[PDB]
């Protein structure tokens, strides 16, 4: 019951989709190629992270990996995704007038291979308590693209979501699990879904199959983001954009409401005060 | 100067150069997938290690890192490299240790030494003294003049006296690739640089080998028997859990009640 319906759909009706269900899935989002080059460019960071072989150590039964600061990482992170002309449009539409600007909070690949238990249906934006107590008559706050790395099957764990679970009226309510509905996703195939959509990620029943994910989850200016980028070496920010160097915090954000300027050195640009360019 | 080799140079050669003058570059020996693979897994542990300090180091390498474990400690021309060094009387040898080394700005140059003077005994022979210490060299990042590469002496590993560790315009300046090697004997007079740059940490990959009948340096025995049975015999053997093979005494050394060490503590025979 959730619409894919978006190759020739323009963006509008996606701001559109998510704003009357929570959540939406664009088809045919990453061209194979990209995620061919995404998977190549993420396989050793990860098999660096996790040795299988371990002296105890922290723990041997490993059904879960997942990383973040990708813009060190990944290069294609670092210039496609976070330019791409799709996720922006949408960004922009489902923050509207009153956000203005906005900035990635966190970019993270997860990995949940076989045997992971299922999740507890539950909303993101309950880690801001604030915010939450408002519940469906809160301002937009988190916006998720969940990329497919992989083929997303209910039979490995396909992540479920309740339509219109972001507006309703009490978030203590999480839902029940008979109006969960699977996103079975295959290539690129991605899914959007907002911080008051409830959600809950899959069982990997397969003795076999390991579901693979890349999630860009994006704030609004105000609201602080979970991943500093400031270890990110020079090098590696002056190669980006200034659109996705505002993205990861090394530019200033323009609400407009405060049409000056937030996020500023000495009132003044910031990525111009530590070396960038103008 | 020193001598770079490699792609079409055999192994043979670089042990020639090695004897001649006790330094060698082999160019581009480590791939720069395995460079990134090294760094990826040593960064977490450089990271926790404990005014700040400008010198940086880890040991214990094959306990923390699986590429030190299989492709450095199985790597075929560092073993070519060491039968050539020790040569027939030897027969055998094994790493005395494995290290991480890390210099960033501030780093002050460095007195020329001749490492093998942590043995007095073989020292006082100076240049007629047997082969003991071989050091691989790899680098992780540049090695510039301008963050400190090492600097040798070429041929000052065969002088007469070791008291004269020479002077500093004797010296030349190994530069390196990030992924180059430089070879050198405990012999060879040698001395790290200066590291004037404000902004730029010098990382290199040092494993000292010995011959059978010298103690290493690096105790390997608190490895997670989980990483010790996860490595090859050779591997094995270079860190201490196997026993040796001398030439000079055939039937073995280093083991456990007259029979194979490794087998005797529960490893596959
Ligand atoms: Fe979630
Ligand atoms: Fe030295």
Same mark, same amino acid.
């Given at each position: 019951?959730? #619409?894919?319906?978006?190759?020739?759909?323009?963006?509008?009706?996606?701001?559109?989709?998510?704003?009357?269900?929570?959540?939406?899935?664009?088809?045919?989002?990453?061209?194979?190629?990209?995620?061919?080059?995404?998977?190549? !460019?993420?396989?050793?960071?990860?098999?660096?992270?996790?040795?299988?072989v371990?002296?105890?150590?922290? %723990?041997?039964?490993?059904?879960?990996?997942?990383?973040?600061?990708?813009?060190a #990482?990944?290069?294609?992170?670092?210039?496609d995704?976070?330019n791409?002309?799709?996720?922006?449009?949408?960004?922009?539409?489902? %923050? +509207?007038?009153?956000?203005?600007?906005?900035?990635?909070?966190?970019?993270?690949?997860?990995?949940?291979?076989?045997? &992971?238990?299922?999740?507890?249906?539950?909303? $993101?934006?309950?880690?801001?308590?604030?915010?939450?107590?408002?519940?469906?008559?809160?301002?937009?706050?988190?916006?998720?693209?969940?990329? =497919?790395?992989?083929?997303?099957?209910?039979?490995?764990?396909?992540?479920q979501?309740?339509?219109?679970?972001?507006?309703?009226? $009490?978030?203590?309510?999480?839902?029940? #699990?008979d109006?969960?509905?699977?996103?079975?996703?295959?290539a +690129?195939? @991605?899914?959007?879904?907002?911080?008051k &959509?409830?959600?809950?990620?899959? =069982?990997?029943?397969?003795?076999?199959?390991?579901?693979?994910?890349?999630?860009?989850?994006?704030?609004?200016?105000?609201?602080?983001?979970?991943?500093?980028?400031?270890?990110?070496?020079?090098?590696?920010?002056?190669? @980006?954009?200034?659109? =996705?160097?505002?993205?990861?915090?090394?530019?200033?954000?323009?609400?407009?409401?405060?049409?000056?300027?937030?996020?500023?050195? #000495?009132?003044? !640009?910031?990525?111009?005060?530590?070396?960038?360019?103008?």
């Amino acid at each position: 019951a959730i #619409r894919h319906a978006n190759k020739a759909t323009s963006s509008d009706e996606i701001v559109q989709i998510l704003e009357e269900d929570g959540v939406v899935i664009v088809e045919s989002f990453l061209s194979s190629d990209l995620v061919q080059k995404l998977n190549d !460019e993420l396989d050793p960071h990860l098999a660096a992270l996790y040795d299988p072989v371990s002296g105890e150590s922290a %723990y041997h039964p490993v059904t879960t990996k997942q990383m973040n600061d990708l813009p060190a #990482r990944s290069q294609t992170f670092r210039q496609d995704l976070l330019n791409n002309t799709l996720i922006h449009k949408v960004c922009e539409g489902f %923050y +509207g007038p009153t956000v203005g600007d906005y900035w990635m909070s966190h970019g993270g690949v997860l990995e949940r291979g076989p045997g &992971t238990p299922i999740q507890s249906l539950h909303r $993101d934006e309950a880690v801001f308590p604030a915010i939450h107590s408002l519940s469906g008559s809160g301002p937009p706050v988190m916006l998720h693209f969940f990329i =497919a790395l992989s083929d997303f099957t209910a039979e490995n764990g396909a992540t479920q979501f309740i339509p219109g679970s972001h507006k309703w009226a $009490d978030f203590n309510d999480n839902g029940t #699990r008979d109006q969960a509905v699977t996103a079975i996703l295959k290539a +690129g195939e @991605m899914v959007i879904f907002t911080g008051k &959509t409830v959600h809950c990620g899959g =069982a990997n029943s397969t003795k076999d199959s390991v579901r693979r994910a890349l999630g860009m989850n994006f704030h609004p200016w105000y609201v602080t983001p979970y991943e500093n980028f400031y270890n990110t070496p020079r090098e590696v920010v002056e190669s @980006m954009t200034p659109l =996705a160097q505002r993205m990861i915090g090394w530019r200033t954000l323009h609400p407009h409401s405060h049409s000056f300027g937030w996020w500023l050195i #000495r009132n003044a !640009e910031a990525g111009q005060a530590l070396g960038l360019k103008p």
